[PDB]
Protein backbone atom coordinates (compact mmCIF):
# COMPACT_ATOMS: atom_id res chain seq x y z
CA UNK A 1 0.00 0.00 0.00
CA UNK A 2 2.91 2.45 -0.51
CA UNK A 3 3.33 5.17 -3.17
CA UNK A 4 5.72 8.02 -4.06
CA UNK A 5 4.91 11.61 -5.14
CA UNK A 6 7.26 14.23 -6.65
CA UNK A 7 6.31 17.93 -6.89
CA UNK A 8 8.09 20.29 -9.33
CA UNK A 9 7.61 23.80 -10.70
CA UNK A 10 9.11 27.29 -10.74
CA UNK A 11 10.85 28.61 -7.66
CA UNK A 12 8.54 30.41 -5.22
CA UNK A 13 5.41 29.02 -6.82
CA UNK A 14 4.40 27.51 -3.47
CA UNK A 15 5.55 23.88 -3.52
CA UNK A 16 7.08 23.63 -0.04
CA UNK A 17 4.28 25.55 1.74
CA UNK A 18 1.68 23.32 0.06
CA UNK A 19 3.36 20.18 1.40
CA UNK A 20 3.72 21.72 4.86
CA UNK A 21 0.08 22.80 5.08
CA UNK A 22 -1.05 19.34 3.95
CA UNK A 23 1.33 17.45 6.27
CA UNK A 24 1.39 19.67 9.35
CA UNK A 25 -1.88 21.62 9.09
CA UNK A 26 -0.51 25.19 9.46
CA UNK A 27 0.91 27.58 6.88
CA UNK A 28 4.58 28.34 7.69
CA UNK A 29 4.79 32.11 8.19
CA UNK A 30 8.49 32.93 8.97
CA UNK A 31 10.71 29.92 8.30
CA UNK A 32 10.24 27.94 5.11
CA UNK A 33 12.87 25.38 4.09
CA UNK A 34 14.05 25.32 0.51
CA UNK A 35 12.76 21.75 0.23
CA UNK A 36 10.39 19.88 2.50
CA UNK A 37 12.11 16.86 4.02
CA UNK A 38 10.73 13.56 2.92
CA UNK A 39 7.57 12.66 4.81
CA UNK A 40 5.08 9.83 4.50
CA UNK A 41 1.45 11.01 4.51
CA UNK A 42 -1.45 8.74 5.42
CA UNK A 43 -4.09 9.13 2.72
CA UNK A 44 -7.51 7.43 2.92
CA UNK A 45 -9.15 6.62 -0.44
CA UNK A 46 -12.31 4.44 -0.77
CA UNK A 47 -11.75 3.26 2.79
CA UNK A 48 -8.21 2.06 1.97
CA UNK A 49 -5.07 3.48 3.64
CA UNK A 50 -2.03 4.15 1.47
CA UNK A 51 1.21 5.76 2.58
CA UNK A 52 2.28 8.64 0.27
CA UNK A 53 5.91 9.77 0.36
CA UNK A 54 6.16 13.48 -0.52
CA UNK A 55 9.33 14.43 -2.47
CA UNK A 56 9.88 18.18 -2.75
CA UNK A 57 12.28 19.66 -5.33
CA UNK A 58 13.95 23.00 -6.12
CA UNK A 59 16.24 24.78 -8.59
CA UNK A 60 19.02 26.14 -6.32
CA UNK A 61 22.52 25.33 -7.65
CA UNK A 62 22.80 21.68 -6.58
CA UNK A 63 19.09 21.06 -5.89
CA UNK A 64 18.47 21.75 -9.57
CA UNK A 65 21.22 19.34 -10.68
CA UNK A 66 19.95 16.53 -8.37
CA UNK A 67 16.24 16.82 -9.23
CA UNK A 68 16.17 14.11 -11.99
CA UNK A 69 17.23 11.55 -9.34
CA UNK A 70 13.85 12.06 -7.58
CA UNK A 71 11.80 10.68 -10.44
CA UNK A 72 12.94 7.03 -10.24
CA UNK A 73 10.39 4.82 -8.52
CA UNK A 74 7.79 7.62 -8.62
CA UNK A 75 4.08 7.01 -9.07
CA UNK A 76 2.65 10.51 -9.64
CA UNK A 77 4.04 13.93 -10.50
CA UNK A 78 2.60 17.28 -9.45
CA UNK A 79 3.53 20.12 -11.77
CA UNK A 80 2.85 23.43 -10.06
CA UNK A 81 2.50 27.03 -11.13
CA UNK A 82 1.39 30.16 -9.26
CA UNK A 83 -1.91 31.87 -10.16
CA UNK A 84 -0.30 35.33 -9.72
CA UNK A 85 2.47 34.40 -12.18
CA UNK A 86 1.50 33.65 -15.79
CA UNK A 87 5.24 33.28 -16.48
CA UNK A 88 5.27 30.23 -14.21
CA UNK A 89 2.38 28.85 -16.25
CA UNK A 90 4.36 29.35 -19.49
CA UNK A 91 7.18 27.26 -17.99
CA UNK A 92 4.77 24.41 -17.20
CA UNK A 93 4.44 23.87 -20.93
CA UNK A 94 7.97 25.00 -21.83
CA UNK A 95 10.36 23.59 -19.20
CA UNK A 96 8.58 21.23 -16.78
CA UNK A 97 6.65 19.04 -19.22
CA UNK A 98 9.77 18.54 -21.30
CA UNK A 99 11.61 17.38 -18.21
CA UNK A 100 8.89 14.93 -17.12
CA UNK A 101 8.64 13.52 -20.64
CA UNK A 102 12.40 13.15 -20.77
CA UNK A 103 12.56 11.39 -17.35
CA UNK A 104 9.12 9.86 -16.68
CA UNK A 105 6.68 9.92 -19.60
CA UNK A 106 4.50 7.10 -18.24
CA UNK A 107 3.61 8.70 -14.92
CA UNK A 108 0.33 10.51 -14.27
CA UNK A 109 0.62 14.29 -13.99
CA UNK A 110 -1.57 16.55 -11.89
CA UNK A 111 -1.39 20.25 -12.85
CA UNK A 112 -1.70 22.39 -9.70
CA UNK A 113 -2.61 26.07 -9.57
CA UNK A 114 -1.05 27.32 -6.32
CA UNK A 115 -1.66 30.60 -4.46
CA UNK A 116 -5.25 30.62 -5.74
CA UNK A 117 -6.04 33.25 -3.07
CA UNK A 118 -4.17 35.84 -5.16
CA UNK A 119 -6.55 35.59 -8.13
CA UNK A 120 -8.65 38.64 -7.31
CA UNK A 121 -6.10 40.60 -5.34
CA UNK A 122 -5.98 44.21 -6.63
CA UNK A 123 -2.27 44.75 -6.00
CA UNK A 124 -1.43 41.72 -8.12
CA UNK A 125 -3.94 42.79 -10.80
CA UNK A 126 -2.31 46.22 -10.98
CA UNK A 127 1.22 44.75 -11.18
CA UNK A 128 0.27 42.27 -13.94
CA UNK A 129 -1.70 45.02 -15.73
CA UNK A 130 1.56 46.81 -16.53
CA UNK A 131 2.40 44.10 -19.08
CA UNK A 132 -1.24 43.36 -20.08
CA UNK A 133 -1.20 40.19 -18.00
CA UNK A 134 -3.83 38.91 -15.58
CA UNK A 135 -3.89 36.28 -12.84
CA UNK A 136 -4.39 32.84 -14.41
CA UNK A 137 -8.00 31.83 -15.00
CA UNK A 138 -9.31 28.32 -14.37
CA UNK A 139 -9.98 28.22 -18.12
CA UNK A 140 -6.34 28.89 -19.04
CA UNK A 141 -5.24 26.49 -16.32
CA UNK A 142 -7.54 23.69 -17.46
CA UNK A 143 -6.47 24.53 -21.01
CA UNK A 144 -2.77 24.01 -20.22
CA UNK A 145 -3.52 20.77 -18.35
CA UNK A 146 -5.07 19.33 -21.51
CA UNK A 147 -2.23 20.63 -23.70
CA UNK A 148 0.30 18.84 -21.49
CA UNK A 149 -1.87 15.76 -21.14
CA UNK A 150 -2.40 15.92 -17.39
CA UNK A 151 -4.57 13.56 -15.36
CA UNK A 152 -6.35 16.29 -13.46
CA UNK A 153 -6.24 20.06 -13.05
CA UNK A 154 -6.64 21.36 -9.51
CA UNK A 155 -6.47 24.73 -7.81
CA UNK A 156 -5.46 25.33 -4.23
CA UNK A 157 -4.34 27.90 -1.68
CA UNK A 158 -1.87 26.81 0.96
CA UNK A 159 -2.36 30.17 2.64
CA UNK A 160 -6.09 29.81 3.16
CA UNK A 161 -6.02 25.99 3.33
CA UNK A 162 -8.39 25.62 0.37
CA UNK A 163 -8.23 22.65 -1.95
CA UNK A 164 -5.05 21.24 -0.39
CA UNK A 165 -6.58 17.90 0.65
CA UNK A 166 -8.14 17.41 -2.79
CA UNK A 167 -4.70 17.67 -4.44
CA UNK A 168 -3.22 14.87 -2.34
CA UNK A 169 -6.25 12.59 -2.30
CA UNK A 170 -6.51 12.85 -6.11
CA UNK A 171 -2.76 12.41 -6.63
CA UNK A 172 -2.99 9.28 -4.47
CA UNK A 173 -5.88 7.87 -6.50
CA UNK A 174 -3.74 8.28 -9.65
CA UNK A 175 -0.66 6.76 -7.97
CA UNK A 176 -2.47 3.48 -7.18
CA UNK A 177 -2.01 1.92 -10.64
CA UNK B 1 -10.78 13.10 -27.94
CA UNK B 2 -12.23 9.53 -27.80
CA UNK B 3 -12.28 6.83 -25.11
CA UNK B 4 -13.85 3.39 -24.77
CA UNK B 5 -15.65 1.91 -21.72
CA UNK B 6 -16.77 -1.70 -21.25
CA UNK B 7 -19.21 -2.67 -18.53
CA UNK B 8 -19.39 -6.22 -17.20
CA UNK B 9 -21.10 -8.03 -14.33
CA UNK B 10 -23.76 -10.63 -13.58
CA UNK B 11 -26.92 -10.71 -15.64
CA UNK B 12 -29.68 -8.46 -14.20
CA UNK B 13 -27.30 -6.55 -11.91
CA UNK B 14 -28.32 -3.35 -13.71
CA UNK B 15 -25.68 -2.76 -16.40
CA UNK B 16 -27.99 -1.94 -19.32
CA UNK B 17 -30.31 0.37 -17.36
CA UNK B 18 -27.32 2.30 -16.03
CA UNK B 19 -26.03 3.06 -19.54
CA UNK B 20 -29.48 4.04 -20.86
CA UNK B 21 -30.14 6.41 -17.98
CA UNK B 22 -26.75 8.07 -18.46
CA UNK B 23 -26.98 8.16 -22.27
CA UNK B 24 -30.66 8.90 -22.82
CA UNK B 25 -31.71 10.50 -19.56
CA UNK B 26 -34.74 8.34 -18.72
CA UNK B 27 -34.95 5.08 -16.83
CA UNK B 28 -36.11 2.37 -19.29
CA UNK B 29 -39.31 0.71 -18.18
CA UNK B 30 -41.12 -0.40 -21.35
CA UNK B 31 -38.43 -2.02 -23.48
CA UNK B 32 -35.08 -3.05 -21.97
CA UNK B 33 -32.59 -4.80 -24.30
CA UNK B 34 -30.16 -7.44 -23.18
CA UNK B 35 -27.33 -5.06 -24.18
CA UNK B 36 -27.62 -1.39 -25.12
CA UNK B 37 -26.68 -0.40 -28.66
CA UNK B 38 -23.13 0.86 -28.80
CA UNK B 39 -23.31 4.63 -28.09
CA UNK B 40 -20.85 7.53 -27.79
CA UNK B 41 -21.46 9.91 -24.85
CA UNK B 42 -19.98 13.38 -24.37
CA UNK B 43 -18.38 13.67 -20.94
CA UNK B 44 -16.83 16.92 -19.69
CA UNK B 45 -13.70 16.72 -17.50
CA UNK B 46 -11.54 19.74 -16.50
CA UNK B 47 -13.40 21.72 -19.13
CA UNK B 48 -12.58 19.16 -21.87
CA UNK B 49 -15.27 17.34 -23.85
CA UNK B 50 -14.25 13.72 -24.44
CA UNK B 51 -16.29 11.17 -26.38
CA UNK B 52 -16.89 8.02 -24.35
CA UNK B 53 -17.95 4.92 -26.32
CA UNK B 54 -20.23 2.72 -24.22
CA UNK B 55 -19.85 -1.07 -24.72
CA UNK B 56 -22.54 -3.18 -22.98
CA UNK B 57 -22.05 -6.95 -22.42
CA UNK B 58 -24.13 -9.95 -21.26
CA UNK B 59 -24.16 -13.70 -20.55
CA UNK B 60 -24.84 -16.52 -27.40
CA UNK B 61 -23.34 -13.85 -25.14
CA UNK B 62 -21.25 -15.67 -22.49
CA UNK B 63 -18.92 -16.71 -25.35
CA UNK B 64 -18.89 -13.58 -27.64
CA UNK B 65 -18.26 -11.13 -24.78
CA UNK B 66 -14.41 -11.14 -25.06
CA UNK B 67 -14.65 -9.37 -28.45
CA UNK B 68 -15.69 -6.22 -26.57
CA UNK B 69 -12.42 -5.93 -24.64
CA UNK B 70 -9.98 -4.83 -27.37
CA UNK B 71 -9.05 -1.12 -27.29
CA UNK B 72 -10.75 -0.38 -23.98
CA UNK B 73 -9.48 2.36 -21.69
CA UNK B 74 -11.64 1.69 -18.61
CA UNK B 75 -13.71 -1.23 -17.32
CA UNK B 76 -16.77 -1.10 -15.09
CA UNK B 77 -17.33 -4.24 -13.06
CA UNK B 78 -20.84 -4.09 -11.67
CA UNK B 79 -22.81 -5.84 -8.98
CA UNK B 80 -26.24 -5.19 -7.47
CA UNK B 81 -26.65 -4.04 -3.88
CA UNK B 82 -29.59 -6.40 -3.37
CA UNK B 83 -27.42 -9.38 -4.45
CA UNK B 84 -24.36 -10.25 -2.37
CA UNK B 85 -23.93 -13.22 -4.74
CA UNK B 86 -23.22 -10.76 -7.55
CA UNK B 87 -20.58 -9.20 -5.34
CA UNK B 88 -19.08 -12.64 -4.73
CA UNK B 89 -18.78 -13.12 -8.52
CA UNK B 90 -16.69 -10.00 -8.97
CA UNK B 91 -13.73 -11.97 -7.56
CA UNK B 92 -14.81 -15.51 -8.44
CA UNK B 93 -15.51 -14.74 -12.13
CA UNK B 94 -15.14 -11.15 -13.34
CA UNK B 95 -11.72 -9.94 -12.09
CA UNK B 96 -9.84 -12.87 -13.62
CA UNK B 97 -11.56 -12.36 -16.98
CA UNK B 98 -10.86 -8.63 -17.28
CA UNK B 99 -7.20 -9.16 -16.31
CA UNK B 100 -6.98 -12.08 -18.77
CA UNK B 101 -8.16 -9.92 -21.71
CA UNK B 102 -7.13 -6.38 -20.71
CA UNK B 103 -4.69 -6.53 -17.78
CA UNK B 104 -3.54 -2.92 -18.32
CA UNK B 105 -6.69 -1.06 -17.60
CA UNK B 106 -8.10 0.88 -14.63
CA UNK B 107 -11.08 -0.89 -13.09
CA UNK B 108 -14.04 0.74 -11.33
CA UNK B 109 -16.20 -1.38 -9.04
CA UNK B 110 -19.79 -0.08 -9.26
CA UNK B 111 -22.54 -0.91 -6.77
CA UNK B 112 -25.80 -0.76 -8.70
CA UNK B 113 -29.43 -0.60 -7.54
CA UNK B 114 -28.27 1.32 -4.46
CA UNK B 115 -31.87 2.53 -4.00
CA UNK B 116 -32.65 -1.00 -2.75
CA UNK B 117 -30.22 -0.94 0.20
CA UNK B 118 -32.95 0.13 2.63
CA UNK B 119 -35.90 -1.49 0.83
CA UNK B 120 -37.73 -3.60 3.43
CA UNK B 121 -38.87 -6.35 1.09
CA UNK B 122 -35.32 -6.81 -0.20
CA UNK B 123 -33.92 -7.02 3.35
CA UNK B 124 -36.39 -9.75 4.33
CA UNK B 125 -35.69 -11.82 1.19
CA UNK B 126 -31.94 -11.80 1.84
CA UNK B 127 -32.67 -12.55 5.50
CA UNK B 128 -34.07 -15.92 4.46
CA UNK B 129 -30.62 -16.87 3.11
CA UNK B 130 -28.69 -15.27 6.01
CA UNK B 131 -27.65 -12.29 3.91
CA UNK B 132 -28.25 -8.54 3.87
CA UNK B 133 -27.92 -5.83 1.21
CA UNK B 134 -24.29 -5.02 0.43
CA UNK B 135 -22.91 -2.27 2.63
CA UNK B 136 -20.46 0.42 1.57
CA UNK B 137 -17.82 -1.26 3.74
CA UNK B 138 -18.44 -4.65 2.10
CA UNK B 139 -18.08 -3.10 -1.37
CA UNK B 140 -14.96 -1.07 -0.61
CA UNK B 141 -13.32 -4.21 0.77
CA UNK B 142 -13.82 -5.99 -2.55
CA UNK B 143 -12.62 -2.89 -4.43
CA UNK B 144 -9.44 -3.18 -2.36
CA UNK B 145 -8.97 -6.92 -2.97
CA UNK B 146 -9.56 -6.13 -6.66
CA UNK B 147 -6.96 -3.36 -6.80
CA UNK B 148 -9.71 -1.28 -8.38
CA UNK B 149 -9.29 2.39 -9.28
CA UNK B 150 -12.47 3.54 -7.56
CA UNK B 151 -15.49 2.19 -5.75
CA UNK B 152 -18.76 3.92 -6.53
CA UNK B 153 -22.41 3.30 -5.63
CA UNK B 154 -25.33 4.38 -7.78
CA UNK B 155 -29.03 4.01 -8.58
CA UNK B 156 -30.25 4.24 -12.18
CA UNK B 157 -33.87 4.09 -10.97
CA UNK B 158 -33.55 7.35 -9.01
CA UNK B 159 -30.42 8.74 -10.82
CA UNK B 160 -28.27 9.12 -7.65
CA UNK B 161 -24.57 8.86 -8.48
CA UNK B 162 -24.94 7.98 -12.17
CA UNK B 163 -23.21 11.10 -13.55
CA UNK B 164 -20.38 10.63 -11.05
CA UNK B 165 -19.80 7.02 -12.17
CA UNK B 166 -19.21 8.00 -15.79
CA UNK B 167 -17.24 11.16 -15.01
CA UNK B 168 -14.91 9.05 -12.83
CA UNK B 169 -14.51 6.43 -15.57
CA UNK B 170 -13.53 9.12 -18.08
CA UNK B 171 -10.92 10.51 -15.72
CA UNK B 172 -9.57 6.97 -15.28
CA UNK B 173 -9.64 6.30 -19.04
CA UNK B 174 -7.10 9.11 -19.50
CA UNK B 175 -4.24 6.91 -18.24
N1 LIG C 1 -0.62 34.16 -1.23
C1 LIG C 1 0.01 32.97 -1.12
N2 LIG C 1 1.36 32.88 -0.99
C2 LIG C 1 1.98 31.69 -0.89
C3 LIG C 1 1.17 30.48 -0.92
N3 LIG C 1 2.03 29.43 -0.79
C4 LIG C 1 3.28 29.95 -0.69
N4 LIG C 1 3.24 31.29 -0.74
C5 LIG C 1 4.43 32.16 -0.68
O1 LIG C 1 5.27 31.94 -1.83
C6 LIG C 1 6.63 32.10 -1.47
C7 LIG C 1 7.35 30.84 -1.93
O2 LIG C 1 6.69 29.70 -1.39
P1 LIG C 1 7.44 28.27 -1.27
O3 LIG C 1 6.54 27.24 -0.63
O4 LIG C 1 8.75 28.36 -0.51
O5 LIG C 1 7.63 28.06 -2.85
P2 LIG C 1 8.54 26.90 -3.46
O6 LIG C 1 9.85 27.54 -3.87
O7 LIG C 1 7.84 26.31 -4.66
O8 LIG C 1 8.79 25.87 -2.38
C8 LIG C 1 6.65 32.25 0.04
O9 LIG C 1 6.73 33.64 0.40
C9 LIG C 1 5.29 31.80 0.51
O10 LIG C 1 4.94 32.52 1.69
C10 LIG C 1 -0.30 30.65 -1.05
O11 LIG C 1 -1.11 29.69 -1.07
N5 LIG C 1 -0.77 31.89 -1.14
N1 LIG D 1 -34.25 -1.02 -8.06
C1 LIG D 1 -33.47 -0.89 -9.17
N2 LIG D 1 -33.63 -1.79 -10.17
C2 LIG D 1 -32.88 -1.69 -11.29
C3 LIG D 1 -31.88 -0.61 -11.40
N3 LIG D 1 -31.27 -0.76 -12.59
C4 LIG D 1 -31.82 -1.84 -13.20
N4 LIG D 1 -32.78 -2.38 -12.41
C5 LIG D 1 -33.58 -3.56 -12.75
O1 LIG D 1 -32.74 -4.70 -12.90
C6 LIG D 1 -33.31 -5.58 -13.86
C7 LIG D 1 -32.23 -5.86 -14.87
O2 LIG D 1 -31.69 -4.61 -15.27
P1 LIG D 1 -30.67 -4.55 -16.49
O3 LIG D 1 -30.22 -3.13 -16.74
O4 LIG D 1 -31.27 -5.21 -17.70
O5 LIG D 1 -29.50 -5.41 -15.84
P2 LIG D 1 -28.35 -6.03 -16.75
O6 LIG D 1 -28.72 -7.50 -16.95
O7 LIG D 1 -27.06 -5.93 -15.99
O8 LIG D 1 -28.20 -5.32 -18.09
C8 LIG D 1 -34.46 -4.82 -14.50
O9 LIG D 1 -35.69 -5.19 -13.86
C9 LIG D 1 -34.18 -3.38 -14.14
O10 LIG D 1 -35.34 -2.55 -14.17
C10 LIG D 1 -31.77 0.33 -10.26
O11 LIG D 1 -30.94 1.27 -10.29
N5 LIG D 1 -32.58 0.12 -9.22
MG1 LIG E 1 10.73 25.00 -2.53
MG1 LIG F 1 -28.31 -7.22 -19.73
Author numbering:
A (entry chain B): 4 to 180
B (entry chain A): 4 to 62, 65 to 180
Question: What do the study authors state?
Answer:
The Rho protein, a homolog of Ras, is a member of the Ras superfamily of small GTPases. Rho family proteins are involved in cytoskeletal organization, cell mobility, and polarity, and are implicated in cancer morphogenesis.
The gel filtration showed that the protein existed as a monomer, but the asymmetric unit comprised a dimeric SpRho1–GDP complex, which suggested the possibility of a monomer–dimer equilibrium in the solution. The bound GDP molecule was well defined in the electron density map and located within a positively charged pocket formed by residues Ala16, Gly18, Lys19, Thr20, Cys21, Lys119, and Asp121, along with a Mg2+ ion. The structure of the GDP-bound form of SpRho1 was similar to that of HsRhoA–GDP–Mg2+ (Hs: Homo sapiens), which also showed a Mg2+ coordination with two threonine, GDP, and water molecules. We found that SpRho1 resembled all three of the complexes examined, with good superimposition and RMSD values of less than 1 Å.
